[PDB]
Amino acid sequence: SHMHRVINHPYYFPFNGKQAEDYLRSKERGDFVIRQSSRGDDHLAITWKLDKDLFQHVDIQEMEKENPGKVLVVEGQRYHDLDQIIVEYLQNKIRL
């Protein structure tokens, strides 16, 4: 239910990178979605709006633990869940 939490997340949209850009066009600077990625080695990504017609894209890496399920890795900060990720990209948008 790691998979279940990610895919049904309110900020998760089943978009590719182009469509995420398209959706962000009518949003504001710093808005973002978690969306899908057909490469991989990662099937998740973040896309967010830097400015009018300018976007950033980042891969979300999904790895296992070996302890007690999965762990998200974005530019090399580890996270459990999308939630901690959403928190930071909202604080990002905030400091504008």
What is the CATH topology descriptor? SHC Adaptor Protein
Give the strand order of the largest sheet, numbering strands 1, 2, ... along the chain.
1-2-3-4-5
In the CATH scheme, the class would be Alpha Beta
Strand content: 25-35%
| Alpha carbon gap, first and last residue | 35 Å
Q: Structural class given helices, strands, pairing?
A: alpha+beta
Domain SH2: 10-96
Protein name: Transcription elongation factor SPT6
Subcellular location: Nucleus; Chromosome
Family: Belongs to the SPT6 family.
General description of the model:
This protein is an alpha+beta fold and 96 residues long. The protein has a single domain, classed as SH2 domain (SHC Adaptor Protein, 2-Layer Sandwich). 28% of the residues lie in helices and 33% in strands. The chain contains three helices and five strands; from the N terminus they run ααβββββα. It has a five-stranded antiparallel beta sheet with strand order 1-2-3-4-5. A hairpin with a 2-residue loop joins β2 (44-51) and β3 (54-64). The termini are far apart.
